[PDB]
PDB file of C-alpha atoms and ligand atoms in Angstrom:
ATOM      1  CA  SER J  10       3.825  36.606  34.307  1.00  0.00           C
ATOM      2  CA  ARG J  11       4.285  35.763  30.919  1.00  0.00           C
ATOM      3  CA  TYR J  12       1.574  35.575  28.470  1.00  0.00           C
ATOM      4  CA  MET J  13      -0.204  39.124  28.516  1.00  0.00           C
ATOM      5  CA  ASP J  14      -2.977  40.984  26.782  1.00  0.00           C
ATOM      6  CA  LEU J  15      -5.592  38.131  26.074  1.00  0.00           C
ATOM      7  CA  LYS J  16      -8.373  38.986  23.129  1.00  0.00           C
ATOM      8  CA  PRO J  17     -11.004  35.919  22.925  1.00  0.00           C
ATOM      9  CA  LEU J  18     -10.394  34.101  19.355  1.00  0.00           C
ATOM     10  CA  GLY J  19     -13.501  32.242  19.282  1.00  0.00           C
ATOM     11  CA  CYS J  20     -14.847  28.900  20.698  1.00  0.00           C
ATOM     12  CA  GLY J  21     -13.644  25.022  19.865  1.00  0.00           C
ATOM     13  CA  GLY J  22     -15.574  21.758  21.371  1.00  0.00           C
ATOM     14  CA  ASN J  23     -12.711  21.626  24.149  1.00  0.00           C
ATOM     15  CA  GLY J  24     -13.056  25.287  25.321  1.00  0.00           C
ATOM     16  CA  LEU J  25     -12.566  29.146  23.804  1.00  0.00           C
ATOM     17  CA  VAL J  26      -9.507  30.212  22.721  1.00  0.00           C
ATOM     18  CA  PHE J  27      -7.408  33.530  23.668  1.00  0.00           C
ATOM     19  CA  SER J  28      -4.723  35.571  21.901  1.00  0.00           C
ATOM     20  CA  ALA J  29      -1.974  36.596  23.037  1.00  0.00           C
ATOM     21  CA  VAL J  30       1.232  37.749  23.364  1.00  0.00           C
ATOM     22  CA  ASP J  31       4.402  36.475  25.138  1.00  0.00           C
ATOM     23  CA  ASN J  32       6.717  38.652  27.331  1.00  0.00           C
ATOM     24  CA  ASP J  33      10.148  35.814  27.198  1.00  0.00           C
ATOM     25  CA  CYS J  34       9.811  36.580  22.928  1.00  0.00           C
ATOM     26  CA  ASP J  35       7.810  39.282  21.930  1.00  0.00           C
ATOM     27  CA  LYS J  36       6.028  37.431  19.700  1.00  0.00           C
ATOM     28  CA  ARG J  37       2.487  36.067  19.294  1.00  0.00           C
ATOM     29  CA  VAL J  38       0.957  32.538  20.756  1.00  0.00           C
ATOM     30  CA  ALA J  39      -2.251  31.081  21.069  1.00  0.00           C
ATOM     31  CA  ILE J  40      -3.724  29.522  23.724  1.00  0.00           C
ATOM     32  CA  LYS J  41      -7.134  27.077  24.416  1.00  0.00           C
ATOM     33  CA  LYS J  42      -8.314  27.401  28.308  1.00  0.00           C
ATOM     34  CA  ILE J  43     -10.596  23.878  28.981  1.00  0.00           C
ATOM     35  CA  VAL J  44     -12.519  23.746  32.135  1.00  0.00           C
ATOM     36  CA  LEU J  45     -12.710  20.652  34.043  1.00  0.00           C
ATOM     37  CA  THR J  46     -16.614  20.661  34.670  1.00  0.00           C
ATOM     38  CA  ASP J  47     -16.883  17.112  34.860  1.00  0.00           C
ATOM     39  CA  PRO J  48     -14.556  13.849  35.783  1.00  0.00           C
ATOM     40  CA  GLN J  49     -15.627  12.833  32.383  1.00  0.00           C
ATOM     41  CA  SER J  50     -13.733  16.711  30.902  1.00  0.00           C
ATOM     42  CA  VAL J  51     -10.591  15.802  32.628  1.00  0.00           C
ATOM     43  CA  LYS J  52     -10.208  12.371  31.207  1.00  0.00           C
ATOM     44  CA  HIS J  53     -11.226  13.388  28.245  1.00  0.00           C
ATOM     45  CA  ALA J  54      -8.247  16.782  28.600  1.00  0.00           C
ATOM     46  CA  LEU J  55      -5.786  14.229  29.707  1.00  0.00           C
ATOM     47  CA  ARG J  56      -6.013  11.902  26.677  1.00  0.00           C
ATOM     48  CA  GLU J  57      -5.453  14.933  24.247  1.00  0.00           C
ATOM     49  CA  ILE J  58      -2.087  16.587  26.383  1.00  0.00           C
ATOM     50  CA  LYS J  59      -0.475  12.858  25.663  1.00  0.00           C
ATOM     51  CA  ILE J  60      -0.495  13.349  21.994  1.00  0.00           C
ATOM     52  CA  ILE J  61      -0.243  16.828  21.266  1.00  0.00           C
ATOM     53  CA  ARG J  62       2.968  16.258  23.596  1.00  0.00           C
ATOM     54  CA  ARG J  63       4.441  13.755  21.399  1.00  0.00           C
ATOM     55  CA  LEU J  64       3.606  14.991  17.917  1.00  0.00           C
ATOM     56  CA  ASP J  65       6.163  17.236  15.855  1.00  0.00           C
ATOM     57  CA  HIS J  66       6.076  18.205  12.407  1.00  0.00           C
ATOM     58  CA  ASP J  67       5.468  21.061   9.679  1.00  0.00           C
ATOM     59  CA  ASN J  68       2.232  20.549   8.835  1.00  0.00           C
ATOM     60  CA  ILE J  69       0.286  20.061  12.330  1.00  0.00           C
ATOM     61  CA  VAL J  70       0.208  23.199  14.406  1.00  0.00           C
ATOM     62  CA  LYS J  71       3.233  23.774  17.164  1.00  0.00           C
ATOM     63  CA  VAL J  72       2.704  23.013  20.952  1.00  0.00           C
ATOM     64  CA  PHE J  73       4.447  24.999  23.456  1.00  0.00           C
ATOM     65  CA  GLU J  74       3.690  24.452  27.049  1.00  0.00           C
ATOM     66  CA  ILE J  75       0.944  23.176  29.045  1.00  0.00           C
ATOM     67  CA  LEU J  76      -0.449  24.870  32.133  1.00  0.00           C
ATOM     68  CA  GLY J  77      -3.016  24.590  34.514  1.00  0.00           C
ATOM     69  CA  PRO J  78      -5.001  28.720  36.714  1.00  0.00           C
ATOM     70  CA  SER J  79      -1.968  31.304  37.433  1.00  0.00           C
ATOM     71  CA  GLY J  80       0.327  29.406  34.836  1.00  0.00           C
ATOM     72  CA  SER J  81       2.268  26.616  35.910  1.00  0.00           C
ATOM     73  CA  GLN J  82       3.675  24.064  33.893  1.00  0.00           C
ATOM     74  CA  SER J  95      -8.647  24.596  34.429  1.00  0.00           C
ATOM     75  CA  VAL J  96      -5.561  24.047  31.876  1.00  0.00           C
ATOM     76  CA  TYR J  97      -4.507  26.150  29.128  1.00  0.00           C
ATOM     77  CA  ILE J  98      -2.943  24.793  25.910  1.00  0.00           C
ATOM     78  CA  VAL J  99      -0.211  27.165  25.116  1.00  0.00           C
ATOM     79  CA  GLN J 100       0.271  26.538  20.996  1.00  0.00           C
ATOM     80  CA  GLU J 101       1.653  28.680  17.721  1.00  0.00           C
ATOM     81  CA  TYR J 102      -0.295  31.754  15.967  1.00  0.00           C
ATOM     82  CA  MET J 103      -1.690  31.041  12.698  1.00  0.00           C
ATOM     83  CA  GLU J 104      -2.627  34.269  10.557  1.00  0.00           C
ATOM     84  CA  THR J 105      -5.204  32.932   9.529  1.00  0.00           C
ATOM     85  CA  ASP J 106      -7.654  28.935   9.012  1.00  0.00           C
ATOM     86  CA  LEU J 107      -8.759  28.172   5.426  1.00  0.00           C
ATOM     87  CA  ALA J 108     -12.488  28.712   6.405  1.00  0.00           C
ATOM     88  CA  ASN J 109     -11.796  32.515   6.506  1.00  0.00           C
ATOM     89  CA  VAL J 110      -9.578  32.257   3.065  1.00  0.00           C
ATOM     90  CA  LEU J 111     -12.548  30.474   1.213  1.00  0.00           C
ATOM     91  CA  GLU J 112     -15.133  32.546   1.873  1.00  0.00           C
ATOM     92  CA  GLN J 113     -13.639  34.932  -0.220  1.00  0.00           C
ATOM     93  CA  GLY J 114     -13.009  32.874  -3.086  1.00  0.00           C
ATOM     94  CA  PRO J 115     -11.660  29.825  -4.858  1.00  0.00           C
ATOM     95  CA  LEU J 116      -8.473  29.085  -5.098  1.00  0.00           C
ATOM     96  CA  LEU J 117      -5.793  28.465  -7.874  1.00  0.00           C
ATOM     97  CA  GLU J 118      -5.253  24.950  -8.495  1.00  0.00           C
ATOM     98  CA  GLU J 119      -0.958  26.152  -7.675  1.00  0.00           C
ATOM     99  CA  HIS J 120      -2.620  26.903  -4.491  1.00  0.00           C
ATOM    100  CA  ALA J 121      -5.204  24.107  -3.996  1.00  0.00           C
ATOM    101  CA  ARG J 122      -2.494  21.339  -5.080  1.00  0.00           C
ATOM    102  CA  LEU J 123       0.089  22.646  -2.997  1.00  0.00           C
ATOM    103  CA  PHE J 124      -2.269  22.970   0.290  1.00  0.00           C
ATOM    104  CA  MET J 125      -4.013  19.481  -0.756  1.00  0.00           C
ATOM    105  CA  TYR J 126       0.543  18.509  -0.620  1.00  0.00           C
ATOM    106  CA  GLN J 127       0.616  19.955   2.809  1.00  0.00           C
ATOM    107  CA  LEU J 128      -2.566  18.987   4.199  1.00  0.00           C
ATOM    108  CA  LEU J 129      -1.743  15.042   2.845  1.00  0.00           C
ATOM    109  CA  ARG J 130       1.426  14.978   4.624  1.00  0.00           C
ATOM    110  CA  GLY J 131       0.277  16.371   7.775  1.00  0.00           C
ATOM    111  CA  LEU J 132      -2.330  13.304   7.431  1.00  0.00           C
ATOM    112  CA  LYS J 133       0.750  10.909   6.398  1.00  0.00           C
ATOM    113  CA  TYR J 134       2.404  12.032   9.190  1.00  0.00           C
ATOM    114  CA  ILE J 135      -0.440  11.682  12.294  1.00  0.00           C
ATOM    115  CA  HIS J 136      -1.552   8.334  11.395  1.00  0.00           C
ATOM    116  CA  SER J 137       1.650   7.070  11.399  1.00  0.00           C
ATOM    117  CA  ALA J 138       1.917   7.156  14.933  1.00  0.00           C
ATOM    118  CA  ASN J 139      -2.226   5.327  14.994  1.00  0.00           C
ATOM    119  CA  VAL J 140      -3.675   9.278  15.135  1.00  0.00           C
ATOM    120  CA  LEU J 141      -6.448  10.459  13.218  1.00  0.00           C
ATOM    121  CA  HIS J 142      -8.023  13.845  13.376  1.00  0.00           C
ATOM    122  CA  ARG J 143     -11.719  13.242  14.808  1.00  0.00           C
ATOM    123  CA  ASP J 144     -12.761  17.041  13.006  1.00  0.00           C
ATOM    124  CA  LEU J 145     -11.461  17.820   9.842  1.00  0.00           C
ATOM    125  CA  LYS J 146     -12.849  20.710   8.172  1.00  0.00           C
ATOM    126  CA  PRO J 147     -11.542  24.117   7.006  1.00  0.00           C
ATOM    127  CA  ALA J 148     -11.984  26.033  10.114  1.00  0.00           C
ATOM    128  CA  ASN J 149      -9.243  23.765  11.674  1.00  0.00           C
ATOM    129  CA  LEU J 150      -6.578  23.756   8.619  1.00  0.00           C
ATOM    130  CA  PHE J 151      -4.593  27.111   9.608  1.00  0.00           C
ATOM    131  CA  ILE J 152      -2.861  29.084   7.024  1.00  0.00           C
ATOM    132  CA  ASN J 153       0.389  31.844   7.419  1.00  0.00           C
ATOM    133  CA  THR J 154      -0.330  33.419   3.313  1.00  0.00           C
ATOM    134  CA  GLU J 155       2.963  35.366   3.399  1.00  0.00           C
ATOM    135  CA  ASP J 156       5.238  31.270   3.466  1.00  0.00           C
ATOM    136  CA  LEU J 157       2.061  29.216   2.195  1.00  0.00           C
ATOM    137  CA  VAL J 158       2.600  26.945   5.070  1.00  0.00           C
ATOM    138  CA  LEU J 159      -0.717  24.995   6.317  1.00  0.00           C
ATOM    139  CA  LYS J 160      -0.638  22.901   9.186  1.00  0.00           C
ATOM    140  CA  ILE J 161      -3.661  21.559  11.111  1.00  0.00           C
ATOM    141  CA  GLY J 162      -5.243  22.153  14.770  1.00  0.00           C
ATOM    142  CA  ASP J 163      -4.181  19.958  17.419  1.00  0.00           C
ATOM    143  CA  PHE J 164      -7.617  20.021  18.690  1.00  0.00           C
ATOM    144  CA  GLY J 165      -9.917  16.232  17.052  1.00  0.00           C
ATOM    145  CA  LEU J 166      -6.001  14.647  17.335  1.00  0.00           C
ATOM    146  CA  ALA J 167      -7.073  10.983  18.922  1.00  0.00           C
ATOM    147  CA  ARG J 168      -5.590   7.315  18.889  1.00  0.00           C
ATOM    148  CA  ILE J 169      -6.644   5.233  16.798  1.00  0.00           C
ATOM    149  CA  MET J 170      -8.132   2.989  19.914  1.00  0.00           C
ATOM    150  CA  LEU J 180     -24.847  17.214  23.839  1.00  0.00           C
ATOM    151  CA  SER J 181     -23.618  20.187  21.549  1.00  0.00           C
ATOM    152  CA  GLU J 182     -24.014  17.065  19.031  1.00  0.00           C
ATOM    153  CA  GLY J 183     -26.099  19.174  16.084  1.00  0.00           C
ATOM    154  CA  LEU J 184     -23.133  21.055  16.433  1.00  0.00           C
ATOM    155  CA  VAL J 185     -20.981  19.222  14.807  1.00  0.00           C
ATOM    156  CA  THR J 186     -21.125  19.710  10.578  1.00  0.00           C
ATOM    157  CA  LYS J 187     -22.184  16.207   8.642  1.00  0.00           C
ATOM    158  CA  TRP J 188     -20.309  18.160   5.660  1.00  0.00           C
ATOM    159  CA  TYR J 189     -16.994  16.097   5.526  1.00  0.00           C
ATOM    160  CA  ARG J 190     -18.370  12.636   7.133  1.00  0.00           C
ATOM    161  CA  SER J 191     -17.973   9.678   4.735  1.00  0.00           C
ATOM    162  CA  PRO J 192     -20.513   7.342   3.424  1.00  0.00           C
ATOM    163  CA  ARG J 193     -18.876   4.938   6.052  1.00  0.00           C
ATOM    164  CA  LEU J 194     -19.103   7.200   9.174  1.00  0.00           C
ATOM    165  CA  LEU J 195     -22.641   8.393   8.149  1.00  0.00           C
ATOM    166  CA  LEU J 196     -24.222   4.151   7.965  1.00  0.00           C
ATOM    167  CA  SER J 197     -21.638   3.961  11.325  1.00  0.00           C
ATOM    168  CA  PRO J 198     -21.364   7.568  13.314  1.00  0.00           C
ATOM    169  CA  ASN J 199     -19.105   6.435  16.073  1.00  0.00           C
ATOM    170  CA  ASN J 200     -16.343   4.788  14.554  1.00  0.00           C
ATOM    171  CA  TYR J 201     -12.911   7.253  13.349  1.00  0.00           C
ATOM    172  CA  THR J 202     -10.358   5.301  10.989  1.00  0.00           C
ATOM    173  CA  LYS J 203      -7.384   6.825   9.047  1.00  0.00           C
ATOM    174  CA  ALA J 204      -9.768   6.915   5.413  1.00  0.00           C
ATOM    175  CA  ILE J 205     -12.315   9.066   7.134  1.00  0.00           C
ATOM    176  CA  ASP J 206      -9.285  11.427   7.361  1.00  0.00           C
ATOM    177  CA  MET J 207      -9.158  10.955   3.810  1.00  0.00           C
ATOM    178  CA  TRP J 208     -12.473  11.177   3.058  1.00  0.00           C
ATOM    179  CA  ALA J 209     -12.623  15.254   4.661  1.00  0.00           C
ATOM    180  CA  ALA J 210      -8.828  15.556   2.601  1.00  0.00           C
ATOM    181  CA  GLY J 211     -11.393  15.250  -0.965  1.00  0.00           C
ATOM    182  CA  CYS J 212     -13.785  17.363   0.227  1.00  0.00           C
ATOM    183  CA  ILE J 213     -12.110  19.853   1.453  1.00  0.00           C
ATOM    184  CA  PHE J 214      -9.359  19.782  -1.802  1.00  0.00           C
ATOM    185  CA  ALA J 215     -13.116  20.323  -4.108  1.00  0.00           C
ATOM    186  CA  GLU J 216     -13.806  23.117  -1.788  1.00  0.00           C
ATOM    187  CA  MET J 217     -10.768  24.845  -3.129  1.00  0.00           C
ATOM    188  CA  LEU J 218     -10.815  24.517  -6.757  1.00  0.00           C
ATOM    189  CA  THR J 219     -14.495  25.419  -6.682  1.00  0.00           C
ATOM    190  CA  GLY J 220     -15.265  28.409  -3.547  1.00  0.00           C
ATOM    191  CA  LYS J 221     -18.595  25.866  -1.944  1.00  0.00           C
ATOM    192  CA  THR J 222     -19.012  22.840  -0.508  1.00  0.00           C
ATOM    193  CA  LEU J 223     -18.691  20.079  -2.439  1.00  0.00           C
ATOM    194  CA  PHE J 224     -22.228  17.884  -0.397  1.00  0.00           C
ATOM    195  CA  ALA J 225     -23.688  21.064   1.304  1.00  0.00           C
ATOM    196  CA  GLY J 226     -26.878  18.596   3.552  1.00  0.00           C
ATOM    197  CA  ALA J 227     -27.599  19.859   7.183  1.00  0.00           C
ATOM    198  CA  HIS J 228     -28.603  15.676   7.933  1.00  0.00           C
ATOM    199  CA  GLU J 229     -27.333  12.782   7.976  1.00  0.00           C
ATOM    200  CA  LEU J 230     -29.869  10.992   5.436  1.00  0.00           C
ATOM    201  CA  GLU J 231     -29.642  14.208   2.631  1.00  0.00           C
ATOM    202  CA  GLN J 232     -25.953  13.868   2.580  1.00  0.00           C
ATOM    203  CA  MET J 233     -26.477  10.452   1.810  1.00  0.00           C
ATOM    204  CA  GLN J 234     -28.384  11.423  -1.001  1.00  0.00           C
ATOM    205  CA  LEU J 235     -26.414  14.078  -2.437  1.00  0.00           C
ATOM    206  CA  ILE J 236     -22.908  11.990  -1.986  1.00  0.00           C
ATOM    207  CA  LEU J 237     -25.414   9.020  -3.821  1.00  0.00           C
ATOM    208  CA  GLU J 238     -25.880  11.683  -6.976  1.00  0.00           C
ATOM    209  CA  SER J 239     -22.714  11.856  -8.393  1.00  0.00           C
ATOM    210  CA  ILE J 240     -20.639   9.202  -6.207  1.00  0.00           C
ATOM    211  CA  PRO J 241     -20.767   5.136  -7.948  1.00  0.00           C
ATOM    212  CA  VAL J 242     -20.776   2.315  -5.315  1.00  0.00           C
ATOM    213  CA  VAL J 243     -19.054  -0.309  -7.443  1.00  0.00           C
ATOM    214  CA  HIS J 244     -19.255  -3.254  -4.678  1.00  0.00           C
ATOM    215  CA  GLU J 245     -22.144  -5.644  -3.779  1.00  0.00           C
ATOM    216  CA  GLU J 246     -21.666  -5.586  -0.508  1.00  0.00           C
ATOM    217  CA  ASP J 247     -21.770  -1.833  -0.371  1.00  0.00           C
ATOM    218  CA  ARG J 248     -25.067  -2.031  -2.363  1.00  0.00           C
ATOM    219  CA  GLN J 249     -26.707  -4.421  -0.539  1.00  0.00           C
ATOM    220  CA  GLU J 250     -25.926  -2.338   3.234  1.00  0.00           C
ATOM    221  CA  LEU J 251     -27.752   0.700   1.994  1.00  0.00           C
ATOM    222  CA  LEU J 252     -30.678  -1.086   0.234  1.00  0.00           C
ATOM    223  CA  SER J 253     -31.023  -1.956   4.110  1.00  0.00           C
ATOM    224  CA  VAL J 254     -31.316   2.059   5.039  1.00  0.00           C
ATOM    225  CA  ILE J 255     -32.679   3.931   1.274  1.00  0.00           C
ATOM    226  CA  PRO J 256     -35.128   0.859  -1.064  1.00  0.00           C
ATOM    227  CA  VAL J 257     -35.144   3.711  -3.680  1.00  0.00           C
ATOM    228  CA  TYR J 258     -32.614   2.607  -5.380  1.00  0.00           C
ATOM    229  CA  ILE J 259     -33.398  -0.840  -5.682  1.00  0.00           C
ATOM    230  CA  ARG J 260     -33.847  -0.559  -9.421  1.00  0.00           C
ATOM    231  CA  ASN J 261     -30.694   2.617 -10.299  1.00  0.00           C
ATOM    232  CA  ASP J 262     -27.302   0.746 -11.422  1.00  0.00           C
ATOM    233  CA  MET J 263     -25.625   2.415  -8.702  1.00  0.00           C
ATOM    234  CA  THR J 264     -21.872   2.629 -11.062  1.00  0.00           C
ATOM    235  CA  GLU J 265     -22.877   5.381 -13.188  1.00  0.00           C
ATOM    236  CA  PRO J 266     -24.547   8.924 -10.682  1.00  0.00           C
ATOM    237  CA  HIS J 267     -26.221  11.233 -12.351  1.00  0.00           C
ATOM    238  CA  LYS J 268     -23.989  13.740 -11.819  1.00  0.00           C
ATOM    239  CA  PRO J 269     -20.677  12.472 -11.505  1.00  0.00           C
ATOM    240  CA  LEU J 270     -17.399  14.857 -10.342  1.00  0.00           C
ATOM    241  CA  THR J 271     -17.092  15.641 -13.805  1.00  0.00           C
ATOM    242  CA  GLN J 272     -19.997  18.151 -13.907  1.00  0.00           C
ATOM    243  CA  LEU J 273     -20.027  19.141  -9.788  1.00  0.00           C
ATOM    244  CA  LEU J 274     -16.717  20.201 -10.769  1.00  0.00           C
ATOM    245  CA  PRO J 275     -17.043  22.413 -14.529  1.00  0.00           C
ATOM    246  CA  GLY J 276     -14.217  24.560 -14.903  1.00  0.00           C
ATOM    247  CA  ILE J 277     -11.599  22.276 -13.053  1.00  0.00           C
ATOM    248  CA  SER J 278      -8.721  20.239 -15.033  1.00  0.00           C
ATOM    249  CA  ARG J 279      -9.379  16.630 -16.225  1.00  0.00           C
ATOM    250  CA  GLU J 280      -5.539  15.757 -14.012  1.00  0.00           C
ATOM    251  CA  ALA J 281      -7.145  17.707 -10.682  1.00  0.00           C
ATOM    252  CA  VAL J 282     -10.705  15.824 -11.259  1.00  0.00           C
ATOM    253  CA  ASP J 283      -8.334  12.233 -12.276  1.00  0.00           C
ATOM    254  CA  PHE J 284      -7.038  12.892  -8.530  1.00  0.00           C
ATOM    255  CA  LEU J 285      -9.985  13.563  -6.751  1.00  0.00           C
ATOM    256  CA  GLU J 286     -11.672  10.017  -8.036  1.00  0.00           C
ATOM    257  CA  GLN J 287      -9.532   8.445  -6.636  1.00  0.00           C
ATOM    258  CA  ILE J 288     -10.106   9.476  -2.935  1.00  0.00           C
ATOM    259  CA  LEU J 289     -14.153   9.964  -3.370  1.00  0.00           C
ATOM    260  CA  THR J 290     -14.626   6.706  -3.412  1.00  0.00           C
ATOM    261  CA  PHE J 291     -17.730   4.955  -1.659  1.00  0.00           C
ATOM    262  CA  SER J 292     -15.924   2.289  -0.103  1.00  0.00           C
ATOM    263  CA  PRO J 293     -12.704   2.607   1.862  1.00  0.00           C
ATOM    264  CA  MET J 294     -10.920  -0.400   0.569  1.00  0.00           C
ATOM    265  CA  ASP J 295     -10.737   1.954  -3.206  1.00  0.00           C
ATOM    266  CA  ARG J 296      -9.623   4.767  -1.452  1.00  0.00           C
ATOM    267  CA  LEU J 297      -5.941   5.954  -1.981  1.00  0.00           C
ATOM    268  CA  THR J 298      -4.238   6.306   1.558  1.00  0.00           C
ATOM    269  CA  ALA J 299      -2.055  10.133   2.196  1.00  0.00           C
ATOM    270  CA  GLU J 300       0.913   7.655   1.300  1.00  0.00           C
ATOM    271  CA  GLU J 301      -1.222   6.434  -1.631  1.00  0.00           C
ATOM    272  CA  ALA J 302      -2.268  10.038  -3.152  1.00  0.00           C
ATOM    273  CA  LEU J 303       1.518  11.614  -1.967  1.00  0.00           C
ATOM    274  CA  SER J 304       3.628   8.763  -4.937  1.00  0.00           C
ATOM    275  CA  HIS J 305       0.196   9.837  -6.958  1.00  0.00           C
ATOM    276  CA  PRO J 306       2.300  11.729 -10.117  1.00  0.00           C
ATOM    277  CA  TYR J 307      -0.834  14.511 -10.030  1.00  0.00           C
ATOM    278  CA  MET J 308       1.103  15.435  -5.737  1.00  0.00           C
ATOM    279  CA  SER J 309       4.952  14.081  -6.368  1.00  0.00           C
ATOM    280  CA  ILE J 310       6.363  16.572  -8.887  1.00  0.00           C
ATOM    281  CA  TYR J 311       6.686  19.098  -5.137  1.00  0.00           C
TER     282      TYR J 311
HETATM  283  C1  OWQ L 401     -12.904  29.130  16.638  1.00  0.00           C
HETATM  284  O1  OWQ L 401     -12.060  28.434  17.146  1.00  0.00           O
HETATM  285  C2  OWQ L 401     -10.596  28.225  17.880  1.00  0.00           C
HETATM  286  C3  OWQ L 401      -9.854  26.982  17.402  1.00  0.00           C
HETATM  287  C4  OWQ L 401      -8.630  26.897  17.716  1.00  0.00           C
HETATM  288  C5  OWQ L 401      -8.224  28.309  17.412  1.00  0.00           C
HETATM  289  N1  OWQ L 401      -6.699  28.298  17.247  1.00  0.00           N
HETATM  290  N2  OWQ L 401      -5.693  26.789  18.065  1.00  0.00           N
HETATM  291  N3  OWQ L 401      -4.665  26.558  17.280  1.00  0.00           N
HETATM  292  C6  OWQ L 401      -4.137  28.607  16.806  1.00  0.00           C
HETATM  293  C7  OWQ L 401      -3.689  28.628  16.112  1.00  0.00           C
HETATM  294  N4  OWQ L 401      -3.396  29.982  15.366  1.00  0.00           N
HETATM  295  C8  OWQ L 401      -4.745  30.779  15.107  1.00  0.00           C
HETATM  296  N5  OWQ L 401      -4.640  31.228  14.485  1.00  0.00           N
HETATM  297  C9  OWQ L 401      -5.992  32.208  13.865  1.00  0.00           C
HETATM  298  C10 OWQ L 401      -6.409  31.408  13.463  1.00  0.00           C
HETATM  299  C11 OWQ L 401      -7.821  32.182  12.161  1.00  0.00           C
HETATM  300  N6  OWQ L 401      -7.350  33.289  13.875  1.00  0.00           N
HETATM  301  C12 OWQ L 401      -7.788  35.229  12.779  1.00  0.00           C
HETATM  302  C13 OWQ L 401      -7.563  34.821  11.646  1.00  0.00           C
HETATM  303  C14 OWQ L 401      -8.236  36.270  10.984  1.00  0.00           C
HETATM  304  N7  OWQ L 401      -8.304  37.621  12.034  1.00  0.00           N
HETATM  305  C15 OWQ L 401      -8.485  36.998  13.089  1.00  0.00           C
HETATM  306  C16 OWQ L 401      -8.125  36.399  14.084  1.00  0.00           C
HETATM  307  C17 OWQ L 401      -6.514  33.790  14.093  1.00  0.00           C
HETATM  308  N8  OWQ L 401      -5.798  30.124  15.802  1.00  0.00           N
HETATM  309  C18 OWQ L 401      -5.767  28.665  16.387  1.00  0.00           C
HETATM  310  C19 OWQ L 401      -8.360  29.178  16.807  1.00  0.00           C
HETATM  311  C20 OWQ L 401     -10.190  29.606  16.844  1.00  0.00           C
END
């Protein structure tokens, strides 16, 4: 009786999403319908709800209510309506460095929050970063959020870290950070940094630009891709400075610190925010 005029917004992983208007307050909402197809789906939906119910931050999409069939506080997640998504913004071209830098700050602020709570995002990509163009606010989408402790082909390989390509079911905070670096490069250039369709070509695209500085990392690659055995992995053929040719040296330097092959050398969300390139906000 509360939510009226519902029009589908598209399809996520969990289910169909709809835009609707609330009667209590004349504001717009975004509702996710999750179908309880199998008992595996009910267990998955229940994990997701307990997480999003306790997270409250300026750069995380706000969850208002949870209702079942007929609307009572199939499952329906009522969240805040955002104007657009980052993917729709970047189809229109690259951003001014001032806007990319501001959106990166907000993305990092949102990551620093979820990571502190021992939550990570299993599906970080421009389509799941929501924008209100009026206030230039960026908010990370709730669906994909998971505690650190069918349709497989519909998962993008593009924002996957070298480690996630080698160990496909192991998600960590550092994996969110690699994806954030990739999204930042995409906001600056208006095109995907590493656009592979398969796990191996994605690894080969990364290896053309990212140095392998540890022998442990080098030995692992020689056991999967032995062609690079007499190549000095320390100096790639097409480095990030070449891949990003019109952007500032300050942006590339900050990027080189996030797009490290090893998670051990990679800045954390907290460290990236304390970086001079970000601390000015
Ligand atoms: C594809 O699957 C999905 C998956 C999740 C959503 N979710 N989840 N929480 C949300 C909060 N706000 C919005 N707002 C839309 C962003 C772009 N939408 C338009 C942009 C421009 N024109 C029409 C719609 C509004 N969408 C949300 C939407 C579609």
